[PDB]
Amino acid sequence: NRLLNFLMKHVFHPKRAVFRHNLEIIKTLVECWKDCLSIPYRLIFEKFSGKDPNSKDNSVGIQLLGIVMANDLPPYDPQCGIQSSEYFQALVNNMSFVRYKEVYAAAAEVLGLILRYVMERKNILEESLCELVAKQLKQHQNTMEDK
Numbered sequence: 001n002r003l004l005n006f007l008m009k010h011v012f013h014p015k016r017a018v019f020r021h022n023l024e025i026i027k028t029l030v031e032c033w034k035d036c037l038s039i040p041y042r043l044i045f046e047k048f049s050g051k052d053p054n055s056k057d058n059s060v061g062i063q064l065l066g067i068v069m070a071n072d073l074p075p076y077d078p079q080c081g082i083q084s085s086e087y088f089q090a091l092v093n094n095m096s097f098v099r100y101k102e103v104y105a106a107a108a109e110v111l112g113l114i115l116r117y118v119m120e121r122k123n124i125l126e127e128s129l130c131e132l133v134a135k136q137l138k139q140h141q142n143t144m145e146d147k
Contacts, residue, residue, distance in 0.1 A: 001038040004029060008040060011060055027067050039073055041081035049090045053097035059106065062094070066110045074121065075114065088129045092136050098147050 007029065011022050030039070047061025065075060077084040095107045111133055118126045140147060 001036065004033070004038060005040045005043075008064065009043065011064075023063065023067065026064070027071075030068065030073075031071055034072075037073070039068060041075075041077060045077075045081060045087060045090065048094055050094075053094075053099055056100050056102055058094050058097070059102055062091075062103070062107050062110050066106070066113065069110065069113045069117065074117065084125065085128070088132065092129070092132050095133070095136055096140075098144070104147070 007022075008026055011019070011026070013019055013022060044061045044064050047064065048058040049061075050057050069075065077087040081087070091107060091111065095104055095111065097107075098104050111129075115126065115130060115133075118129075
């Protein structure tokens, strides 16, 4: 657990190849561990909860959530981190950060992954975030048809 939380803290490293290397190490770690779960939240929230959308600074958290979702494990927030209705609101609000193509399309895809898992795992919260992303999209059909 201490290794996983430290290594998931130290990720960024401004060059691209070392970033892809570190993401491969973290992905392979949670791929092979699976049993001492200790999947750490609230630092991912600290990663993608940024304002001022002239900054490619929320890529790390959405990519880490896509890492943890592409395997398995649910992103259950209101058990040890913070309340879910603000967490998902932070995610769907970063979906509107339409300046850099690395953040909003990625957030849209990982939102699709979230919805696809939470539909089949039948717990009744999928209608709220489905309505929230639909609210973002209905905001988006009038103003910018491309995006």
